[PDB]
């Protein structure tokens, strides 16, 4: 909850930081802070990423997944303490090892799939079968995921 409050404060200070003079009285609008331009535009950087850059780093998990009771108070603009950096390295190395092994297993799965469906080639304009699929929007408890 503190991390969420920090994120909200960081946004409410950053996305309207420009307080400009409106031919008289004072008006504030969407800021031209370059980091916020690169994040809000969708160019490079998400809201969560810029939050973990400027506000809190939130919490981060141990190797297993159970997160630390003591989170990373600091961020990347100001200095980051040694223990906080070790806790960060936990997740960083986890993700890095996972992505390498991911590329391995994903290449294997791609080969397997493309070798099970290699021979299927469209060869007729119509099959003349009334049978189809009762395709419907997917609602797995929540709202519509695919309308």
């Amino acid at each position: 909850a503190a991390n969420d409050r920090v994120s909200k404060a960081m946004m409410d200070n950053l996305q309207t930081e420009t307080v400009i003079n409106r031919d008289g009285q004072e008006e504030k609008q969407v800021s031209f802070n370059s980091i916020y331009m690169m994040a809000d535009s969708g160019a490079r950087g998400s809201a969560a990423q810029i939050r973990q850059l400027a506000g809190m780093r939130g919490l981060m998990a141990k190797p297993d997944g159970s997160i630390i009771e003591t989170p990373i108070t600091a961020n990347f603009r100001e200095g980051l303490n040694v223990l906080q950096y070790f806790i960060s390295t936990h997740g960083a190395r986890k993700g890095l090892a996972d992505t390498a092994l991911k590329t391995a297993n994903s290449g294997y799965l791609t080969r397997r799939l493309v070798d099970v469906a290699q021979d299927l080639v469209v060869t007729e304009d119509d099959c003349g079968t009334h049978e189809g699929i009762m395709m419907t929007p997917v609602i797995e408890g929540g709202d519509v995921k695919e309308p």
Binding site: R112, D115, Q118, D119, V121, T123
Partner: protein
Amino acid sequence: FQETTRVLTEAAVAGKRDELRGLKENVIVGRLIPAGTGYAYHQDRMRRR
């Protein structure tokens, strides 16, 4: 794909015969693949047969 020994032995003992009609098979043998710019060539070939 996989288990080349198993499939080769099963094909051998069964006296299996390959009627290529497939992408990977034609790729191995090197002829036109029956999917794409070679589909017309292969439909003509199967029409002649």
